[PDB]
Amino acid sequence: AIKRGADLIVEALEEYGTEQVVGFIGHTSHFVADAFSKSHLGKRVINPATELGGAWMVNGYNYVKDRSAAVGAWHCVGNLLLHAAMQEARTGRIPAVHIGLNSDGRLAGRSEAAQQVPWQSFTPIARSTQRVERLDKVGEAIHEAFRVAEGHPAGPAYVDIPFDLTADQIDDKALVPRGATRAKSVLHAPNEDVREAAAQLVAAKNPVILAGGGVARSGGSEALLKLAEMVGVPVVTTSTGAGVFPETHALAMGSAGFCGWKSANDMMAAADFVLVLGSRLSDWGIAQGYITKMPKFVHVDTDPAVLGTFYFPLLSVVADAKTFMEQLIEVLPGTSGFKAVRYQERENFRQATEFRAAWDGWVREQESGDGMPASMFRAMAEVRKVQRPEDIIVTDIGNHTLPMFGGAILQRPRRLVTSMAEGILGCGFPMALGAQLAEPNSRVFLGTGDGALYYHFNEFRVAVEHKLPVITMVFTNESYGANWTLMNHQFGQNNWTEFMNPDWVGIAKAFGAYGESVRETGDIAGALQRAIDSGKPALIEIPVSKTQGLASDPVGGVGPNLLLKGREIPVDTGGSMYPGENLLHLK
Amino acid sequence: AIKRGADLIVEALEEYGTEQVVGFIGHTSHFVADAFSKSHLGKRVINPATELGGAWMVNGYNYVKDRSAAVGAWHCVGNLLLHAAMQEARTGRIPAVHIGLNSDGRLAGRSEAAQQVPWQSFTPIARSTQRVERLDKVGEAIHEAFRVAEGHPAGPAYVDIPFDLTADQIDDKALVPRGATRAKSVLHAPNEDVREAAAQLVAAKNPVILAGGGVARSGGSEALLKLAEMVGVPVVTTSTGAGVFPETHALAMGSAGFCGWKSANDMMAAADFVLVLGSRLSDWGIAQGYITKMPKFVHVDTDPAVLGTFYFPLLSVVADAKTFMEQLIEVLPGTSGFKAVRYQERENFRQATEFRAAWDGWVREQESGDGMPASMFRAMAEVRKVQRPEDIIVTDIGNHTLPMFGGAILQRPRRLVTSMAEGILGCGFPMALGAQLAEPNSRVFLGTGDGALYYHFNEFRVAVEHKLPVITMVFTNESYGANWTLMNHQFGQNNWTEFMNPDWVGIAKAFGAYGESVRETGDIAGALQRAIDSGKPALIEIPVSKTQGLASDPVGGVGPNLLLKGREIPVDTGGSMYPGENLLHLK
Amino acid sequence: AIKRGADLIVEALEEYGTEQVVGFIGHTSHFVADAFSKSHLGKRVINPATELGGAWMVNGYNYVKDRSAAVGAWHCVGNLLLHAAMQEARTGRIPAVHIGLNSDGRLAGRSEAAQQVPWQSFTPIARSTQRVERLDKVGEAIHEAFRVAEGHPAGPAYVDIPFDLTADQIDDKALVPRGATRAKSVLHAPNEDVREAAAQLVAAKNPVILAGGGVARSGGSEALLKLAEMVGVPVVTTSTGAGVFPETHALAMGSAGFCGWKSANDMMAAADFVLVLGSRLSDWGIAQGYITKMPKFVHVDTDPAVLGTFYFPLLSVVADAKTFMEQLIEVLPGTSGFKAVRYQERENFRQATEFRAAWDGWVREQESGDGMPASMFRAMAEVRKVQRPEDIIVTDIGNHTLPMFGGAILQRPRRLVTSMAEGILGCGFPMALGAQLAEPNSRVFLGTGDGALYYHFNEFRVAVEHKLPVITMVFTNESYGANWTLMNHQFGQNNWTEFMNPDWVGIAKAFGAYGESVRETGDIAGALQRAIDSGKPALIEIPVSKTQGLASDPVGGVGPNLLLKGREIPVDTGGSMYPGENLLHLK
Ligand SMILES: Cc1cc2nc3c(=O)[nH]c(=O)nc-3n(C[C@H](O)[C@H](O)[C@H](O)COP(=O)(O)OP(=O)(O)OC[C@H]3O[C@@H](n4cnc5c(N)ncnc54)[C@H](O)[C@@H]3O)c2cc1C
Ligand SMILES: Cc1cc2nc3c(=O)[nH]c(=O)nc-3n(C[C@H](O)[C@H](O)[C@H](O)COP(=O)(O)OP(=O)(O)OC[C@H]3O[C@@H](n4cnc5c(N)ncnc54)[C@H](O)[C@@H]3O)c2cc1C
Ligand SMILES: Cc1cc2nc3c(=O)[nH]c(=O)nc-3n(C[C@H](O)[C@H](O)[C@H](O)COP(=O)(O)OP(=O)(O)OC[C@H]3O[C@@H](n4cnc5c(N)ncnc54)[C@H](O)[C@@H]3O)c2cc1C
Ligand SMILES: Cc1ncc(C[n+]2csc(CCOP(=O)(O)OP(=O)(O)O)c2C)c(N)n1
Ligand SMILES: Cc1ncc(C[n+]2csc(CCOP(=O)(O)OP(=O)(O)O)c2C)c(N)n1
Ligand SMILES: Cc1ncc(C[n+]2csc(CCOP(=O)(O)OP(=O)(O)O)c2C)c(N)n1
Ligand SMILES: O=C1CCCCC1=O
């Protein structure tokens, strides 16, 4: 049957499981928009204020879904705004398919052409970059994009299609690949490796299980709870893993790292052995700038590239995290040295509970006071009083990241959202809107700095039109507070850190969102109640200090090395000159 | 003297004539910001709301200056936002040096590293992309960047410097190249070429001189006025050339092209010969999607790559525009057939004045009218009543582009600003702020769509803090009106075009800008005067139609081919299968 | 008319002035080879032993022609051999169009595909890299390739065409661009610049004119002779400029640089002013590893990118070399201080003739001597006894390069050929075959090392079949003699330098070439005469020392810095670890 390339694009997207389209209009996307209007995808298309805001929504949506359920579809030069969000998806393991409609292929390669997008700029970023030359390759290329995006490692795939192909027509027989079943990802470990890991766990004086975001992707929460209680071993997470183990449990230390919980950092410093499940041991994660000293450890991942790249394990194992834990549960009764007793009765339990109690005491101290400015730990204590197990916490990047991570106490996977891998400022608001689109009946709370909110608050258009009831706290300090604080330490003076805020309540009201400031009241509790009652996107202005959080608060970190010390470098005396030095030799 | 890398960067920027920095803080830019605070250039730093907004400011500043007088300096991941603005600077011939401070060079190449920016993503976009490996190359790299950016063709240069080199120190002897060197750009043509062009001009029955942006870069206004009057020849411009010839002159036909003046398109259709000076005959300029039929023509440019790429001239000449005109003026008295006659008495004068009169009458009709929705030609007529010769007109991309081009009547060069080469939505507001920074004796009037203003209105923080009294007219239609209109022509139905606006007056007020709506009053003249009187950046909300301008108004255009018709494409019958087709051959 | 893509390719190559094809068969080049067999150009096809050998032939042919008169046409995977020759054409300013026929476009992008050539591997090398997507772009792409290749700077252009488009057919109306267009390259300087250069030249006590390869491209020999005699100024060349000034003239100092004439290096050290015409002042040319100290200088080039990149001139001028000289000759009589005097009576004449005499005496000593091992200066003295003014001297890269440059005494341009820009071993033999194809009225003498001849002596198949009577002297030392010598200077010990030779006379005989060894006879003069008399390609085996030439002979050089001295580098003490260091902190 004769079909337009635009219709075939829509058909392929539907075949591979697309639920949500984020699209931007222009003459190159006209046929695609027309085709979507005839599909069940048409109704709920999001047309964002900008393409980078929309690309952040795709990342929030897909981070919580663990598949490319949201897709981008972009008119030519709007694809030039994608790179920042695309880079986060790469290193942050977010599946995400982007379809770029380029200008007419007849005009490609002409030196004075307009809007001929340099798709080769994505080659260093996307996990897959494809330029489609021929109409009969459109289905094929979209099939490949999903294959790469939803693999191990997950990441972004970009497909560039000159838009004349979207207008052209062809017979459709077999053109969209249909009917594939993917390989299972329940990879089992060798029995000997399971037994060696069991033997280490039972021999250790102060063991730890370290669960990263792979445990969430694997669906391993039930197995982790059973394992940790059976061996009686404290659980530490990464920031992407937080919530895979209930953080109200006596064994829960929280997340290790420089914006994490001191209980977790104390536990990692005390440990003699670690079982690492589904973590890449990253720079701004466990490695803390490659300064952290790992105890002896077993490392279990589905991606061999992460195993042994920097930290050399005692044993590296290619396996699924859930599956590995189930294998371990089966072998432990027959492991020499294993004793089946309640976790509360183990010798290692007191030290772990002490670390947690000391952390919890510090956090309670940070929640105290009723000043202006307010404490961001106090703001999070108020969120917790109105927070359900399914609800999602979002943050942006800055001093505020630390109190958001420290005040988040989670019970389910994928409830903590940000630009985890890259720390790209401005992510938080649009990622929160994407997460809300993915889970319409979950409540989404965002804690954002003022410098951060400046980026994409234009997306209040989408929030108000689509009635996305995200509750946003904007922490105001008239500064890039992390940099204010760090530069004062480093040089004795800050520069480039200060700015004027708008009347944020006035901004919210100008869009038709709920707005309220607690500057004169301190009534964070009441503001959250009123925001929730509104049924609208909401903005609550909360004044904070320039110093609280990332750049100041003692959580047991060792890195990263942000305030590096320069070295004196020798000149080159081999005889070659600098450019222009010729003039200095003239007599 | 022992100096930090950061200090050497600042010294190099000052040496090569930097006047204005647009810079964004983060730990990788800390040493550079500290260095700037100790220097003359430190007094002129804009900290923008976002890096893309700031990169658009660099483009507006440098478009009007024709050199890289503004420079960008960005913390690592913020560089990921630059690509859209950088692509405009490339094809639009805007000099622009961007300094990206990457993360620690020690951490480069590690797969789980944070904030290691893929500088190779700029290779297909910048005219020069350099990754600096060594401290003793920092001055050399910056020198090279300016040389490439300020060449023929002009464009963007990106320099990636790992930030450890900014903290490191070295003896500075000869390290920053001083005393640089620059050839004149007054390239002279051979006498043969001059004589042939003069003979063609004199022999023509209906000649035209076509003046592009190269006449502006050349400084050729005085020579062009003398040559046009001496031979008695109508003048047509490109959109970047508008204003090099006084647009109130009897011989001024205005700009050719699809958003241009119908007098210019009429004259181009009537002409038997064209002398083209400083134009690249581009897709969305004179070529109109490569549909325009050029008369026999002589083509004169400083860049040989533009000569003969698509339109084959009678004669191609490598020469400076001002210089070539001066050579022609000297040769005309001894050219066969030449006689000195007043231009008003030449046989071709009446035809040209008739074309201009017809256009002027149509413009008067488009201004004719009071009430709401307002005509954008009426808005421009009101601007002209309060416009000085050095004032600058800025537009964004959309239906509104055509009335902004058509209602701009200019008397000096470089007074008309937009994303001319690439048509990138949202350029207008930040390019206007950049232009105002560069040209503090110019009043800057921006006519922007609502869909466009949505992108970078966050930059009202810069406009208010730096007291930049740009007068912005936001034309409201609650639509991407160009696409509503094109899609209605193409399909009889629009999709992805409609959206809500905030209360734009409320937005302005929340930033401390002047705000006023004429929705109820129709009082455009009063709103302009009150906006001028305030001394502040101003936002005037003006309701308009969905359809007026680019996608509807007949100005004599022939292209581009935005609404292309699909072709039926044969399948491949070679024998090879589609992916997944194997399952269809099982029985 | 309906035409195959293959036919349209041939038509385009003929239109843009192709004279010679170097082509390699495979199924992807079948249609193109069939098309060539039906065309005028089909009569001039070389099928080389390998694609790299053939690409070197294209370089030799086009170096001497200064246009892309030879073109490559290659079956898919054979394109993978081009990169070395392509890189020489880029930095050495050799025009060269290469047409790669890729595998079926239907199969592109499949991960398990065969012979899908990564054309993106050429992007960092060619001046233009184009992948053609559509049959109706084949003529356009070829047109663009010639425009880039034959520009300023000249260089290589690569066009990748999937071979299905060569079999496909289309109506040909307007598809191959005809009537192309080309601006003159006689760029004139402004009068100010001409007058200043003349005043500097006249005021100097010890001037020099430095003439590079741009004087050859310009055709400026006649003007240079007149200018040098009129002002009475010694002439120095680059290695690509040698022969633009008659090297038997009293004012001829020869070529400066590390493999040049000591008379030229002496004169450059004595000079108070230099006028540089058509030179890029390159690393292994005049810069000598960026160590050379230039006197105050005026720098004149057609390519602004060479002016002021490293050596900062007193004055930079964009102009054609021949033209600028002609302008100078016209201005000199009215320049203050100028007087017409015979050059032999100027006060600077004696110094220059003394330099040349000292060099000539040293060369005579180096020729002094009979017996074995032979002096390579003696071999060149024997060539000169049988050398015509249009004959061509070719060399490879090694110790032997210096005596080939030093014993070549030339009277016309473009008579000295090698991999000048990149020093790529094995260039000599195939570049000599290319040069012979281009210049059938030239006798071509190649002086090659043994290590070099090893690369492409397989091309004796081409030399014999096409009756190309190149006279090759193979200098035998059973070593990479430059590296034996440099390593002995550097370490007191060589490594990886020594090897066996075949019986080279036997090799020649096995191909049907003339072969003779002088190992027993010393009879170089007789061997040259017998080789000429045969009418065949010839190989003369001449034993030589391991050490004579580049790495040993004192010619007044100061660089480059090939034998650099290491520096002690501080470690990083920031706190971060090496990969695997974790295991060292466990106790
Ligand atoms: C300002 C700032 C502060 C931060 N502070 C911290 C902090 O204090 N602590 C912290 O942890 N992070 C912090 N981060 C986040 C950090 O940068 C990383 O994003 C994070 O630590 C990576 O988590 P992960 O190692 O679990 O790997 P992820 O990035 O979540 O990747 C998942 C891993 O699991 C594997 N995997 C996937 N599926 C499976 C499966 N089925 N079975 C087995 N393996 C699987 C993958 O191959 C990969 O190795 C911070 C970031 C910012 C911007
Ligand atoms: C929505 C939209 C609508 C548009 N409508 C129109 C329209 O109607 N008409 C129109 O013209 N454009 C229009 N444009 C702009 C268009 O896309 C191009 O940006 C513009 O036409 C290019 O102008 P130009 O040819 O003068 O070259 P520029 O881009 O200005 O480049 C300068 C040229 O002059 C040469 N040059 C520089 N210095 C010298 C010198 N000293 N001497 C000689 N030569 C020199 C350069 O090498 C180059 O060729 C539109 C753009 C958009 C986005
Ligand atoms: C082992 C080895 C040893 C070598 N030894 C030496 C040595 O001793 N001395 C030496 O000189 N080189 C030597 N070379 C060669 C050297 O590396 C360079 O290839 C050479 O010096 C470059 O010559 P050039 O500066 O004349 O520029 P070219 O590479 O010849 O480039 C031509 C220049 O002229 C300009 N030009 C072109 N047309 C015109 C025109 N119409 N008008 C004006 N300008 C024009 C171009 O833009 C360019 O700047 C050696 C190479 C090797 C491999
Ligand atoms: C795109 C981008 N620009 C800049 C930065 C550097 N950066 C990281 S956190 C931060 C401060 C953010 O300020 P704000 O949102 O107000 O939070 P606070 O530090 O005040 O809590 C900055 C400037 C970045 N990571 N990404
Ligand atoms: C980044 C980007 N996204 C999208 C577009 C496509 N586009 C061009 S003009 C236009 C309409 C803009 O709407 P508005 O600013 O309201 O102007 P109007 O057409 O209503 O005058 C759009 C969507 C583009 N060129 N660049
Ligand atoms: C492809 C390549 N490989 C290696 C070299 C390094 N190289 C340059 S000169 C030289 C010696 C060549 O030996 P030969 O041809 O025998 O000349 P000789 O030095 O003995 O005169 C070598 C190995 C190079 N420049 N290019
Ligand atoms: O989508 C469009 C419509 C025409 C002008 C520009 C553009 O991007």
Ligand SMILES: O=C1CCCCC1=O
């Ligand atoms: O980009 C960042 C992130 C957190 C530390 C400070 C900074 O500038």
Ligand SMILES: O=C1CCCCC1=O
């Ligand atoms: O040219 C060919 C023919 C088929 C085998 C391989 C190849 O390259």
Ligand SMILES: [Mg+2]
């Ligand atoms: Mg803040």
Ligand SMILES: [Mg+2]
């Ligand atoms: Mg609009």
Ligand SMILES: [Mg+2]
């Ligand atoms: Mg040898």
